[PDB]
């Protein structure tokens, strides 16, 4: 019921209204979501409703690994990957658009972590 | 101007459904004022405005002469009127589905939902 980790998940991993989904999108979003001090190396935005993402914690997800959940359907996502090595802003990013399953961690029915290491079929 | 697009959302967009049963349809139809007279068939899409609009763009394909089919499945709830009276209160059966949807777009914006479309 403390919303802190859930809102943190949203800040870092949720954008219902993307524009472009190219490197410029990634570079502006990583800045707007304050993920640039230091440059976050890999960060994926999910483009769907809070309700549908939350449903991965319940009806619309399967157990994955010890504690994660995998979605039962694909989600629109944009993965921003840091380029150029240096961890100090300004931060340059490559942007990878995808429609794929996502793996998250849930706590008390809410998304609290995004598994950036998951490789979807 | 936004009129037909907003009208499309009023009748067919709900990012935050609960229940998705007869009660959901009966409250939503009333809330969206689709009850004077009772609308016979009406589908609510449970996804973002952006993703639905994308059916008019990259996440859709041409369908028929004037329509668009989504390239992926959407969570939907179809409300089908029952009881036989066009007057409030309007009663509904709910059908939850995860399916392709067909819409009409105008200039990149969704303006109608094809209730007659039968998805694989
Ligand atoms: Zn939305
Ligand atoms: Zn009827």
- Edge-first strand order for the sheet with B74-82 is B41-45, B74-82, B91-99
Catalytic residue among A74, A81, A113, A118: A113
- CA distances A84 to A80, A92, A112, Å, are 13, 7, 29
- Edge-first strand order for the sheet with A93-100 is A42-47, A75-82, A93-100
- CA distances A80 to A12, A39, A83, A119, B8, Å, are 11, 11, 9, 15, 33
Q: Which residues contact B103 (CB under 8 A, 6 or more apart)?
A: B8, B52, B55, B56, B60, B67, B68, B70, B110, B111, B112, B113, B114
B112 is catalytic: yes
Give the resolution value in Å: 1.8
DSSP letter, residue A14: B
User: What is the homologous superfamily of the domain A1-121 according to CATH?
Assistant: Ribonuclease A-like domain (3.10.130.10)
Residue spans of alpha helices (H) in chain A:
4-13, 23-32, 50-54
**Strand ranges, E, within B46-90:** 60-63, 67-70, 74-82
Element (DSSP H or E) covering residue A57: none
DSSP, collapsed to helix, strand or coil, labels residue B64 as coil
A47 is catalytic: no
Experimental method: X-ray
At the second CATH level, the architecture of B1-120 is Roll (3.10)
Element (DSSP H or E) covering residue B86: none
DSSP, collapsed to helix, strand or coil, labels residue B42 as strand
What is the spatial distance between Cα B50 and Cα B109, in angstroms, rounded to a whole number? 10
Which of B112, B87, B95, B109 is closest to B30 using CA atoms? B87
Nearest by CB to A16, from B50, B73, B98: name it: B50
The pair of structure tokens assigned to A25 is: 């999108």
Q: Are A83 and A92 in contact (CB under 8 A)?
A: yes
Residue A34, sorted as left (phi over 0), alpha (psi -120 to 50) or beta, turns out to be left
- CB-CB neighbors (< 8 A) of B49 in chain A: 16-17
What is the spatial distance between Cα B82 and Cα A107, in angstroms, rounded to a whole number? 40
What is the spatial distance between Cα B56 and Cα B104, in angstroms, rounded to a whole number? 8
Catalytic residue among A6, A9, A12, A13: A13
What is the spatial distance between Cα B77 and Cα B98, in angstroms, rounded to a whole number? 9
| Domain extent listing, chain B | 1-120
Let me know the angle formed at the C-alpha of B104 by B102 and B108, rounded to the nearest 5 degrees.
115
What is the spatial distance between Cα A45 and Cα A116, in angstroms, rounded to a whole number? 10
What is the spatial distance between Cα A43 and Cα A83, in angstroms, rounded to a whole number? 12
Q: Do B16 and A51 touch (CB under 8 A)?
A: yes
Q: Which residues contact A96 (CB under 8 A, 6 or more apart)?
A: A78, A79, A80, A81
Q: Are B95 and B78 in contact (CB under 8 A)?
A: yes
Q: Which residues contact B113 (CB under 8 A, 6 or more apart)?
A: B8, B11, B12, B43, B45, B101, B102, B103
- CB-CB neighbors (< 8 A) of B50 in chain A: 16-18, 47
B40 is in an annotated binding site: yes
């Amino acid at each position: 019921q403390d919303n802190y980790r859930y809102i943190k998940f949203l800040t870092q991993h949720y954008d219902a209204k993307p524009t472009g989904r190219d490197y410029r999108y990634c570079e502006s979003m990583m800045k707007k979501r304050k993920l640039t001090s230091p440059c976050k190396e890999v960060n994926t935005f999910i483009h769907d409703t809070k309700n549908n993402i939350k449903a991965i914690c319940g009806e619309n997800g399967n157990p994955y690994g010890v504690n994660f959940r995998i979605s039962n359907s694909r989600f629109q996502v944009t993965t921003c990957t840091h380029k150029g090595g240096s961890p100090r802003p300004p931060c340059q990013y490559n942007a990878f658009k995808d429609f794929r399953y996502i793996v998250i961690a849930c706590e008390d029915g809410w998304p609290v972590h995004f598994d950036e290491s998951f490789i979807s079929p």
